[PDB]
Design a protein around this nucleic acid. Structure first.
Lengths: 176, 176
DNA sequence: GCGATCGG
DNA sequence: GCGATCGG
């Protein structure tokens, strides 16, 4: 995959927002724009991107075996590098060039945790996870755990999650 | 990668044996046939293969950062799917079809352990490892360990390793 | 730091 | 059963 500017990346995401779908036992099911979240380097507003990173929110557990493994993009040429239920990496043709499209899935109840994980950057996640690990917590893209048991937090958004975890809220661009 | 017959796989390995090399700070270093071992489904003599599996024996630790990351195959078209110091997955062109070639590296002192691991099958490895784990040992492709410490066994071959571990020696085809 | 999807 | 490369 070629490198992209932030603007090229945003243009691609805009194009993709109305064109993603998946095949479910023969039936083409459209993925809704509101369930597509730009994450990664794109959400961090970095100047150059190495890929385009999208998080797809899926409404039901049963659908995970179907969404990424049967992903469809209307009108766009692509090939699959690797693909499972949770991560799918595609190479897409856009104008004269091939770019890497990284797709991830989260269930609705995982959404704040997923956004936080897939936003990164990695250095920042390592620091946050290390501090929580010292207090016997484990944080990942699915939830907050203690002694291998889900800690049910009363949150809906990434911001609420960050504050409930006891860290300073910073906009994605400023996380390091 | 397409599926291959055992015969096709063996023909490919024969071709590759004299044609593998790596670039080391600008110089092309041939890999010797005696340091190339057919492993996996090929060594188990399975009728159909999903890929061709080769283990490359590397004489010095310092060379690991160079071998797979700078692999060269004379006269054969290939592309890299993933590649590190210990695992490299290639797609090769062979008689107008594309196949998957899986390359792994072992240091000389790891060789019997690596052969045993990369031969499998997986079901057999799980059983063997579980039994050793009950006695506080850990077996992997690098050695036999107890309390995170290498158990120095006085062996050279896979057969000697198997017997020293206290299991019945069976030819690769009959391991289950 | 932690998980996905391999790798045998 | 145990480890590698790559995902943020």
């Amino acid at each position: 995959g070629g490198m992209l500017t932030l603007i090229q990346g945003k243009k691609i995401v805009n194009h993709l927002r109305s064109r993603l779908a998946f095949e479910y036992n023969g039936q083409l099911i459209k993925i809704l724009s509101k369930n597509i979240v730009a994450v990664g380097s794109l959400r961090r507003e970095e100047k150059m991107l190495n890929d385009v990173d999208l998080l797809i929110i899926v409404p039901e557990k049963k659908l995970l075996k179907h969404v990424l493994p049967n992903i469809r993009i209307k009108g766009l040429s692509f090939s699959v590098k690797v693909c499972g239920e949770r991560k799918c990496v595609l190479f897409i043709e856009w104008e004269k060039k091939t770019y890497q499209l990284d797709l991830f899935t989260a269930l609705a109840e995982e959404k704040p945790y997923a956004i936080f994980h897939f936003t990164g950057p990695v250095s920042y996640l390592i620091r946050i996870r290390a501090a929580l690990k010292k207090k016997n917590y484990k944080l990942n893209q699915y939830g907050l755990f203690k002694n291998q048991t889900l800690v049910p937090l009363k949150i809906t958004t990434e911001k609420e999650l960050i504050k409930e975890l006891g860290f300073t809220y910073r906009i994605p661009k400023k996380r390091l």
